Amino acid sequence: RTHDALLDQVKKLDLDDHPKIVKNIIKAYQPKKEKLGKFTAVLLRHIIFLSNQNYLKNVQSFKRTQNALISILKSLSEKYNRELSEECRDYINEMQARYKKNHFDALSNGDLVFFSIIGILFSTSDQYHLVITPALILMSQFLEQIKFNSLKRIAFGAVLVRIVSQYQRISKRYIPEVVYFFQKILLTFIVEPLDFENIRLDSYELGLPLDVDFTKKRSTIIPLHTLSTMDTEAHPVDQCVSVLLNVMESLDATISTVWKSLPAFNEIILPIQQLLSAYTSKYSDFEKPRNILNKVEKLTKFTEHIPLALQNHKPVS
Amino acid sequence: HDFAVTSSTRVQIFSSRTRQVIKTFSRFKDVVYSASFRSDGKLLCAGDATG
Amino acid sequence: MVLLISEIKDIAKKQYNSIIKLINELVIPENVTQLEEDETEKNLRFLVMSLFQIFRKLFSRGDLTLLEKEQFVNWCRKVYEAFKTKLLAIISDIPFETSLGLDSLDVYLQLAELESTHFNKTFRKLIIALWSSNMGEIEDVKSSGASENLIIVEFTEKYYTKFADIQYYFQSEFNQLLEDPAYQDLLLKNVGKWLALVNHDKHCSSVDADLEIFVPNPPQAIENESKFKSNFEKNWLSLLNGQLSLQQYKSILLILHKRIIPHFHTPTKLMDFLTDSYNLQSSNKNAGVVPILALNGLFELMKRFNLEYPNFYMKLYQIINPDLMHVKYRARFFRLMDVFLSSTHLSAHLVASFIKKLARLTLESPPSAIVTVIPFIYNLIRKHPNCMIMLHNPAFISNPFQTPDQVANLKTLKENYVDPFDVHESDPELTHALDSSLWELASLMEHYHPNVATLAKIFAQPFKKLSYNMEDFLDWNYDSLLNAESS
Amino acid sequence: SLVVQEFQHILRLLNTNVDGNIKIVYALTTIKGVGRRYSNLVCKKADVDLHKRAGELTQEELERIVQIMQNPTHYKIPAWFLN
Amino acid sequence: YSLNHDQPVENVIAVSPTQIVSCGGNNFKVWDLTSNKKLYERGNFNKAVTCLDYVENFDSPMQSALIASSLDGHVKVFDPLDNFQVKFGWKFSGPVLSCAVS
Amino acid sequence: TGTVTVILSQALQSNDHSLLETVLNNRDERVIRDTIFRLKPALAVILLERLAERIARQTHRQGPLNVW
Structure with missing residues (x-):
């Protein structure tokens, strides 16, 4: 309770399966200010640590207790926000200390799940926030400055794209960085080239050959990041097409939520349009890309595509 | 015996034997752009940056 | 140990014979350091440092104090043996022995002072030793810098940046040593050593500050600044002709742009080098960014003297790319953009081409690059108000107070409208960017960051001012933005 | 071109x-605190052409003006002239 | 009718009742109106030519002279009677913007 | 490498006497060979004509100019 390490040791000694139960009992005893703020600090640190350490238990024995912990966090966040924001700021500062010390060697699926829970909990629709907007630009920097050269980084980008898709389905904003991420991922997947050299990718080793069945039984998004990101070094074409379809589905969801309202979706998608046309000319059996092209063509037909009226203001009296 | 030169908000008339600033024009607001004499050698016209 | 006992004996002291024996022991310390290459006396080298201090004290005593020909020959031989032992310890210090290198450098400097006061060849031998020295982490530091040495970097940072006379004789002896064939190849191998020795920005030709004198009697080291320029230019032409790599290439481009120009005397040879650099366009993604500083040098070259580069704005249109956004020199490149596009003979076609290229760039560009490009766009539009039609067409806007015939005509015009801008067209004058509006600036309106969105609202609102302070709104980064937001 | x-x-x-x-x-007169021949002779001492507009006079002579006017006694300005 | 000077023309000078000069970009084309076509063209200039004037029937060994300044202090004197052949030149360090003759 | 090809070509396209003098002041044979290798044929021809007229004007200048 008083110390994060001490309370983590107590929870581990009691049980990893019912650390949520032990912490809930302790918090109920305590609520019955500073004590509960320290409990919130230790609970956030402990759930991040658990996400970093272990996910071997299945949905029926680990996801249930994780969701119980999430509910306890919802209760303590509905009861307290100031201490939670302060520890969020500290957690930031330590993230960027880690990142400046090691650009890629000091990140965590714990940071990713922290971002996800922050987005789920807070009123993400706010234009400016002491927590959301800082973490928003931190997430942008995370997805942009990472030297994309491996499938674990690709999956990190994919989960970041999913969380910002939630962000801009509840907020409806636009990210040129996620556009660049999509273009870079497509180019590094189909590098195997002559039509795209301004994207400046990093890795010349991974591609996409014509040995995929792309069926429904073929591995879907099914994101087990706490396992996929650490077993992704073994690289089958099934895993490659699964992550490709994951990023493509997130791209389509972002389109259908915000980018239809985006006025320049046509010129946003033009590089993606060329990449997907190359996809179709190379494979000729990609139904989801076909539907994406149909949707973009529909948007081009329905958009005004007319010169704007930016400098049209009313006269002064 | 004389010629006109444009400059910053300033039109200068110089002589030939003296080659000195003979006449000064500074009633412009912004920099002048063009200067031209008439065939009769009396009127000089200047195009400025005010239109 | 034995070194300390010899030190005590020499301090207490046949005094010439004892000093000769101590000098022989300090020359045997070259073999001690050779064995130290495998293990520096259990990786401590404390005895070696004590022996070096003893040798320095003995050399000082010998310089203070000293068959006259035989005695002078013996004293000079002992002093030269100590200096050569220090030079060999510095040269063969493949292992990173910081204390041993520092002791060797201090002993060599003291011996050089004593020789200059009582006895140039010692200087060239010292430089030969320092350049024959090589370390694994020192050879071609690729992430940053030129050569992450130890001995030559400390030599520069506490010995070269202080004495202008030593700088003058320094460059003269490099000219001599480069005329020397084998050591010319030595410099060719250790190019980055000179880069690390020269990027320190406090050289003699920098008349902004003054450098104090090492030798009590400087032998006419202020004979000619143009002679200093000639030595600088000869050394630099030799090094740029020999053994160039990518990181050293970028570093020499930076030092040329910022520091060499005050120190160089063959600007036409710099012209040829810089135009080769700017026309250097290959498939290397790492070598495709040199044209930035290459054009920086070329343009300051054009300013210093009036020469040409054909299809200049053609090359700018070609060179503008998102790789510029991804590289970290885009701040200086935007200063360059200011000083090019500030001309008064540019046209609507050129400004429209550049603004549309930058609009696609800000459609796909990082937010720091967005806040760098916003002031440029605003100032460019304000300077050339001819692009108000593409900012908002007056024919495409509607009004209730006009006839249904014109309503139908406007509807048909909107139906038959098409965007005619061409991206692949390398001619800024030929790209029909006048008709193309900025849906990309509309997306910038619909950005996500609050500060960027406010800058977008500034774009949308009518242009009331001219001064936008490009410098203050020019250098921004992710970390800087986070610091500002937290503050 | x-x-x-x-x-x-x-x-x-x-x-x-x-x-x-x-x-x-x-x-310089409309610069608050200072007046007609104060401005005239500060311009004269700064050694600039008096027929110019303030669009001219780049920053180095601008700062000579500032330093001379803010150190008047250090430029032979007479006390009976001083405020 | 129009006669094409592809690069941006910055000067048009009616040198003669039948001939004109288009002075723009690096080169300059001397056209004739009656033939509606360029009699000659000279590209002997270094950068874009910035100014060009003409003088005729004055006290000189050469009857007519054509001056052109091309942004280098580089002023060059040609002559229409010699098909605008190089006759003289001066170079002034500052890039000249205008030139003229009495 | 250290050639002066672009300056030679510019001077020959616009025959600036001062610039051509400053660019012929040099005497490095490797640079001479590199220039004339990366020089245009007709431009080098008019360059040779310029060298001829300068040797005629100042035969004292022809010393290092005898190898151009």
Whole structure:
């Protein structure tokens, strides 16, 4: 309770399966200010640590207790926000200390799940926030400055794209960085080239050959990041097409939520349009890309595509 | 015996034997752009940056 | 140990014979350091440092104090043996022995002072030793810098940046040593050593500050600044002709742009080098960014003297790319953009081409690059108000107070409208960017960051001012933005 | 066919905002606290042409003006002239 | 009718009642109106030509002279009677913007 | 490498006597060979004509100019 390490040791000694139960009992005893703020600090640190350490238990024995912990966090966040924001700021500062010390060697699926829970909990629709907007630009920097050269980084980008898709389905904003991420991922997947050299990718080793069945039984998004990101070094074409379809589905969801309202979706998608046309000319059996092209063509037909009226203001009296 | 030169908000008339600033024009607001004499050698016209 | 006992004996002291024996022991310390290459006396080298201090004290005593020909020959031989032992310890210090290198450098400097006061060849031998020295982490530091040495970097940072006379004789002896064939190849191998020795920005030709004198009697080291320029230019032409790599290439481009120009005397040879650099366009993604500083040098070259580069704005249109956004020199490149596009003979076609290229760039560009490009766009539009039609067409806007015939005509015009801008067209004058509006600036309106969105609202609102302070709104980064937001 | 050159609008000077579209002596007069021949002779001592507009006078002679006027006694300014 | 000077023309000078000069960009084309076509063209200039004037029937060994300044202090004197052949030149360090003759 | 090809070509396209003098002041044979290798044929021809007229004007200048 008083110390994060001490309370983590107590929870581990009691049980990893019912650390949520032990912490809930302790918090109920305590609520019955500073004590509960320290409990919130230790609970956030402990759930991040658990996400970093272990996910071997299945949905029926680990996801249930994780969701119980999430509910306890919802209760303590509905009861307290100031201490939670302060520890969020500290957690930031330590993230960027880690990142400046090691650009890629000091990140965590714990940071990713922290971002996800922050987005789920807070009123993400706010234009400016002491927590959301800082973490928003931190997430942008995370997805942009990472030297994309491996499938674990690709999956990190994919989960970041999913969380910002939630962000801009509840907020409806636009990210040129996620556009660049999509273009870079497509180019590094189909590098195997002559039509795209301004994207400046990093890795010349991974591609996409014509040995995929792309069926429904073929591995879907099914994101087990706490396992996929650490077993992704073994690289089958099934895993490659699964992550490709994951990023493509997130791209389509972002389109259908915000980018239809985006006025320049046509010129946003033009590089993606060329990449997907190359996809179709190379494979000729990609139904989801076909539907994406149909949707973009529909948007081009329905958009005004007319010169704007930016400098049209009313006269002064 | 004389010629006109444009400059910053300033039109200068110089002589030939003296080659000195003979006449000064500074009633412009912004920099002048063009200067031209008439065939009769009396009127000089200047195009400025005010239109 | 034995070194300390010899030190005590020499301090207490046949005094010439004892000093000769101590000098022989300090020359045997070259073999001690050779064995130290495998293990520096259990990786401590404390005895070696004590022996070096003893040798320095003995050399000082010998310089203070000293068959006259035989005695002078013996004293000079002992002093030269100590200096050569220090030079060999510095040269063969493949292992990173910081204390041993520092002791060797201090002993060599003291011996050089004593020789200059009582006895140039010692200087060239010292430089030969320092350049024959090589370390694994020192050879071609690729992430940053030129050569992450130890001995030559400390030599520069506490010995070269202080004495202008030593700088003058320094460059003269490099000219001599480069005329020397084998050591010319030595410099060719250790190019980055000179880069690390020269990027320190406090050289003699920098008349902004003054450098104090090492030798009590400087032998006419202020004979000619143009002679200093000639030595600088000869050394630099030799090094740029020999053994160039990518990181050293970028570093020499930076030092040329910022520091060499005050120190160089063959600007036409710099012209040829810089135009080769700017026309250097290959498939290397790492070598495709040199044209930035290459054009920086070329343009300051054009300013210093009036020469040409054909299809200049053609090359700018070609060179503008998102790789510029991804590289970290885009701040200086935007200063360059200011000083090019500030001309008064540019046209609507050129400004429209550049603004549309930058609009696609800000459609796909990082937010720091967005806040760098916003002031440029605003100032460019304000300077050339001819692009108000593409900012908002007056024919495409509607009004209730006009006839249904014109309503139908406007509807048909909107139906038959098409965007005619061409991206692949390398001619800024030929790209029909006048008709193309900025849906990309509309997306910038619909950005996500609050500060960027406010800058977008500034774009949308009518242009009331001219001064936008490009410098203050020019250098921004992710970390800087986070610091500002937290503050 | 690019050409290079070397003008300023309303600009700040000693926390006072004065236009670049007015003659130099009288811009310095409208600088608060100082007056007619104060401005005239500070221009004279700064050694600039008196027929110019404040769009001219780039920053180095601008700062000579500032330093001379803010150190008047150190430039042989007579006490009976001082305020 | 129009006669094409592809690069941006910055000067048009009616040198003669039948001939004109288009002075723009690096080169300059001397056209004739009656033939509606360029009699000659000279591209002997270094950068874009910035100014061009003409003088005729004055006290000189050469009857007519054509001056052109091309942004280098580089002023060059040609002559229409010699098909605008190089006759003289001066170079002034500052890039000249205008030139003229009495 | 250290050639002066672009300056030679510019001077020959616009025959600036001062610039051509400053660029012929040099005497490095490797640079001479590199220039004339990366020089245009007709431009080098008119360059040779310029060298001829300068040797005629100042035969004292022809010393290092005898190898151009």
